[PDB]
DNA sequence: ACTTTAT
DNA sequence: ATAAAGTATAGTGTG
């Protein structure tokens, strides 16, 4: 089955609709919103863009101040098929998800990652995950997340997974799938 | 590459 | 004036 992984840019513009999603202030059931876990030692009260401004402007190096539109995490989607979590029980649940969060902790630091938002009240169980792109003092995107990096993301992570007790394989290689939103996604299973 | 942002 | 970092990527499926 397909080890599904897609981070998006986010910026402080767009934080704002992420964290309002992340947590509830219309696909989503009322009845399932509890029981959804945080796998992070974050405060709940305090928003993603405060949190990490803050982390950033006391760990970065430069004296420059935080450009407007920079990356200030990426949210990376963890998902698969809905024949993978039916196999899996409740708390072989918490253990796919909590390998997942630490493939980014091993590979691009533990403080970096900002929130791990777990949804078991939308279609599939999916992790929202965001990564912040601090490396040597340097907060870019552009350096962390580059050509190179998603292209061994996309064939490390899975066989990393399978050293796990779990059974993956990754994406089909040199795709030519086109991302579609969730509205056009949805249109695009209207018709057949 | 080329362009937008903060020195 | 300079220059690090913005744009993209890579992947699947009801995010
Ligand atoms: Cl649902
Ligand atoms: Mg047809
Ligand atoms: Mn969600
Ligand atoms: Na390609």
Redesign the pocket.
């Given at each position: 089955?397909?080890?599904?992984?897609?981070?998006?840019?986010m910026?402080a513009g767009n934080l704002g609709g992420a964290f309002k999603?992340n947590e509830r202030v219309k696909?989503?059931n009322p009845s399932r919103s509890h029981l959804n876990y945080e796998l992070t030692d974050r405060d709940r009260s305090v928003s993603y863009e405060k949190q990490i401004k803050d982390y950033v402007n006391e760990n970065?190096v430069?004296?420059?101040?935080?450009?407007?539109?920079?990356?200030?995490c990426?949210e990376?989607?963890i998902?698969?098929?809905?024949d993978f979590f039916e196999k899996l029980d409740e708390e072989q649940t918490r253990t796919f998800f909590e390998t997942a969060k630490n493939y980014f902790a091993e590979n691009y630091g533990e403080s970096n990652i900002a929130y791990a938002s777990v949804?078991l009240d939308?279609?599939?169980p999916?992790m929202?995950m965001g990564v912040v792109?601090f490396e040597?003092?340097?907060?870019?995107?552009?350096?962390?997340?580059?050509?190179?990096?998603?292209?061994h993301?996309?064939?490390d992570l899975p066989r990393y997974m399978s050293d796990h007790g779990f059974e993956l394989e990754?994406?089909?290689?040199?795709?030519?799938?086109?991302?579609?939103?969730?509205a056009?996604?949805?249109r695009?299973?209207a018709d057949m």
């Open positions: 089955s397909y080890m599904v992984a897609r981070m998006q840019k910026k999603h696909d989503i970065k430069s004296n420059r101040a935080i450009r407007k539109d920079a990356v200030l990426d990376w989607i998902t698969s098929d809905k949804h939308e279609s599939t999916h929202h792109p040597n003092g340097k907060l870019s995107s552009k350096a962390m997340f580059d050509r190179e990096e998603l292209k993301i996309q064939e990754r994406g089909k290689l040199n795709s030519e799938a086109k991302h579609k939103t969730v056009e996604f949805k695009a299973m």
